Design a protein around this ligand. Structure first.
Ligand SMILES: [Mg+2]
Ligand SMILES: [Mg+2]
Ligand SMILES: [Mg+2]
Lengths: 117, 88, 252, 106, 65, 52
RNA sequence: CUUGAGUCUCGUAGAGGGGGGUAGAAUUCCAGGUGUAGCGGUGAAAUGCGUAGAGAUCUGGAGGAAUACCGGUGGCGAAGGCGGCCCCCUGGACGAAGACUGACGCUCAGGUGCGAAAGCGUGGGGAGCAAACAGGAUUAGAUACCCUGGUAGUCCACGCCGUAAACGAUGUCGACUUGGAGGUUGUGCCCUUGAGGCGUGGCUUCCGGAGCUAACGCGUUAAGUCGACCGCCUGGGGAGUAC
């Protein structure tokens, strides 16, 4: 059993799913949760509620590893950003850096074709 | 597309004096020198069609000037094409 | 989906089929009563598959037809025509009309039974029929017409205007008949080699066969077979295609 | 001949040889009968993003009027000399002698 | 407009990071000319300058780098 | 520094960055003719307001 | 002869072209590292991927492709087209102020050459995307629409093809003929400077007068008023099809 505290939190949100993972300052994963592992499937898997629940599951995993400090970064286009990070405010940490780190290309390679719908 | 000094050499050769520019002789000479120089460009830059559009304009402009001078005075025409070696 | 409407061409099709006893006849897709009746009439008894169980009830309860046919109610692509050929004493005459998404499957299932089928007689859309009979050097030619002409001799029977159909389509369509060869004029070591040779070739039909079949064989193999590798895939007869298939199979 | 700006940056841990670099390149300029109108250093200076995983690298400017040929020599000398981590050459309109804003801030 | 036109009339610029900072987002993107009030001539010069300044890590490309 | 005020500050920053609108529209390729048509369509759809 | 044509001297703006370097994002992939039951996908599913550790996230490396933002009712180009940055070669244009030639002009059947996208030819490359294809779904059926894959192709050098609603659906050149609000790019004079304010070319956008037009509309960048030459049409299909 290991106790450390310096914490980086990554929110990886998409219109199918939201993964959340906690890492050390090194970026080394301490533990993680998703929505789909929270148990929701199809439509429920991508909901602000499922993203809160995923954050609660991570909050439990870090209670075992580290809880004093966190630096939270957010990625992917999906819903529930606010919902999952306010769920990190549950068992609240002292955090101040927020931006997205959503990948924007400087005119990178050809995206998929549009859906015929 | 030519240095002022190569232009000066050419106009001081083919021109009436330093006040002359654009006597037919001056024109066809500097135009010829440009055409000669650009052979080096296109010998590398084969695919430079947009540049060679200017070259085609220049060789046809040369032809038009020569033919005007030929009907205006055969002596000036023949000694000028002799000096430039034109109709090569 | 479609089924025919006008007695003139119904009568032309059922008469051109020449359906009589001394033939192991089976309908597929009996559809509207009007075109299944004359064939169930002329044959003293007839077998049929309908895919639909509701139409199979409509026709099996019809006293013209239920007493005069034996009737089956399933996807014909499940159906064991090789056993039905045994039960009918001689290889089958298989015939009719359908919604024809299933058409491409029908041909392969019929070809899975080239021994058990004596002949096939079916309506189809103009472009696919003209493809199916297409001569090697034409844009209408290609892989499915190659496999069809490999398995069988193929023969247009007659051609039908779109106003002839109950829901009339925009699209003219023809009945065609075909005959599994009594011995294959093109003997082949395997058909999967044909199928993959033809798909590779026709997946690349605009480039030279050196840049199609020569992606697998050498130019010296191709010219060794007597084939110019500078041809396009749509210059190539089924004869040299089965020669390639034999070459692939026997040199592997 | 063509006026140029030549502007380049050197590894912080090779910044001590920068005078030797100014010798090597200024000798190429005057050895081409070219002339110089600015030479400047802005010291070790911090980078907006990491260059070659480094920080704080040492910045240098020249204003010059040399014949084209030797610019390609010193340019390719930058790809030979790994102490130079980047360079930019600019075919500027004029010789310019007034100090860089990077100096004039002092 | 005319005050922003004076900013163009006075100067054409590269290496003046202090003035370049007047025309960038904090995320490092170029400001559109209508928001700067400057005329398009100077917008082009500013864009060319910013691109050079990014090449030499004088300005970032993004917020992060 | 209240968490939900730092959240509002963050929300303003990502709105000013436009990143959700960018990644939304960047989801697919497009045949350049249609954004050309859409662009000029918007240009006249705008210009019609200029008239009073 | 100098008014058309054209040369020169000095500037100016520009994704014009050709050639060569180079950058920061980005995707994928590889190699670890931390880590663990999910991931992925949809309407929902499934196929797919993961306990050989995936997914995630950190580092390091690879490779091919494209240039977020500026960027515009914006520039360049004969048209097709041209957009990260620097260099190298290189085409055209416009203004300035003279100087110079001396009608050298325009148009152009044949002819010659340039000519998107697709496809072909020869040899490379292959990240991402993706006809065909393959497999899972959906549907009365579904060949579609959905998804997981995926070849050609997409990229490059060197050949070819020679077509596009290649359309301003508007041939080229020249002259004339109310206005008005912009944009862009030179330039002169006045600037009280710095803003301004008088001018004055070029390019370009939208209104609109007269006139024109079947009408719609066009309208000094004509579809007005006219001069020179070229191209093309002669009811609809059959048919841009046969030969
Ligand atoms: Mg090729
Ligand atoms: Mg292509
Ligand atoms: Mg023809």
């Amino acid at each position: 059993r290991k106790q450390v505290s310096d914490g980086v939190a990554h929110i990886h949100a998409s219109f199918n799913n939201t993964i959340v993972t906690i890492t050390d300052r090194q970026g080394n994963a301490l533990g993680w949760a998703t929505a789909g592992g929270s148990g929701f499937r199809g439509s429920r898997k991508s909901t602000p509620f499922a993203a809160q629940v995923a954050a609660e599951r991570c909050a439990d995993a870090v209670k075992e590893y580290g809880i004093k400090n966190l630096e939270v970064m957010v990625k992917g286009p999906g819903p529930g950003r606010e919902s999952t990070i306010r769920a990190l405010n549950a068992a609240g940490f002292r955090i101040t850096n927020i931006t997205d780190v959503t990948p924007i290309p400087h005119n990178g390679c050809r995206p998929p074709k549009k859906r015929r719908v | 597309s030519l240095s002022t000094e190569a232009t000066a050499k050419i106009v001081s050769e083919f021109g009436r004096d330093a006040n002359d520019t654009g006597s037919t002789e001056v024109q066809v000479a500097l135009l010829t020198a440009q055409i000669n120089h650009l052979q080096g460009h296109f010998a590398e830059h084969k695919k430079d069609h947009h540049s060679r559009r200017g070259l085609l304009r220049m060789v046809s402009q040369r032809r038009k000037l020569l033919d005007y001078l030929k009907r205006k005075d055969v002596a000036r025409y023949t000694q000028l094409i002799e000096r430039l070696g034109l109709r090569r | 989906q479609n089924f025919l409407n006008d007695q003139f061409v119904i009568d032309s099709i059922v008469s051109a089929i020449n359906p009589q006893k001394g033939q192991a006849m089976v309908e597929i897709g009996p559809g509207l009563a009007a075109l299944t009746e004359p064939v169930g009439e002329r044959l003293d008894q007839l077998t049929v598959i309908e895919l639909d169980r509701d139409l199979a009830a409509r026709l099996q309860t019809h006293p013209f037809l239920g007493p005069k046919l034996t009737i089956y109610q399933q996807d014909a692509m499940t159906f064991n025509f090789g056993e039905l050929a045994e039960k009918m004493g001689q290889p089958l005459r298989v015939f009719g009309n359908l919604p024809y998404n299933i058409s491409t499957p029908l041909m392969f299932h019929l070809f899975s039974y080239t021994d058990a089928i004596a002949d096939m007689h079916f309506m189809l859309q103009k472009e696919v029929v003209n493809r199916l009979v297409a001569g090697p050097n034409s844009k209408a030619y290609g892989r499915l017409s190659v496999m069809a002409q490999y398995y069988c001799n193929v023969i247009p029977v007659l051609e039908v205007p779109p106003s002839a159909f109950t829901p009339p389509p925009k699209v003219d369509s023809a009945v065609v008949r075909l005959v599994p060869h009594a011995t294959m004029p093109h003997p082949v070591k395997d058909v999967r080699v044909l199928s993959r040779i033809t798909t590779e070739a026709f997946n690349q039909r605009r480039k030279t066969i050196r840049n199609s079949l020569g992606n697998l064989f050498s130019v010296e193999v191709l010219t060794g077979m007597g084939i110019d590798p500078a041809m396009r895939a749509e210059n190539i007869s089924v004869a040299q295609y089965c020669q390639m298939a034999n070459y692939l199979a026997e040199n592997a | 001949m063509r006026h140029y700006e030549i502007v380049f940056m050197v590894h912080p841990d090779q910044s001590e040889q920068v005078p030797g670099m100014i010798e090597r390149y200024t000798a190429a300029i005057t050895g081409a009968e070219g002339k110089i109108h600015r030479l400047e250093d802005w010291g070790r200076r911090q980078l907006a993003y990491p260059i070659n995983k480094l920080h704080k690298a040492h910045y240098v400017l020249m204003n010059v009027e040399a014949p084209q040929e030797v610019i390609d020599e010193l340019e390719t000398t930058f790809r030979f000399n790994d102490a130079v981590i980047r360079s930019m050459v600019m075919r500027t309109k004029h010789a310019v002698t007034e100090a860089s804003p990077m100096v004039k801030a002092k | 407009f005319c005050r922003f036109t004076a900013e163009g009339v006075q100067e054409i610029d590269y290496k003046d990071i202090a003035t370049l900072k007047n025309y960038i987002t904090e995320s490092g993107k170029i400001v559109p000319s209508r928001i700067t009030g400057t005329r398009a001539k100077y917008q082009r010069q500013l864009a060319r300058a910013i691109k050079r300044a990014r090449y030499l890590s004088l300005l970032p490309y993004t917020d992060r780098h | 520094e209240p968490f939900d005020v730092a959240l509002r500050r963050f929300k303003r920053s990502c709105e000013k960055a436009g990143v959700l609108a960018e990644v939304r529209r960047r989801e697919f390729y497009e045949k350049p003719t249609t954004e050309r048509k859409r662009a000029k369509a918007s240009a006249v759809k705008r210009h019609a307001k200029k008239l009073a």
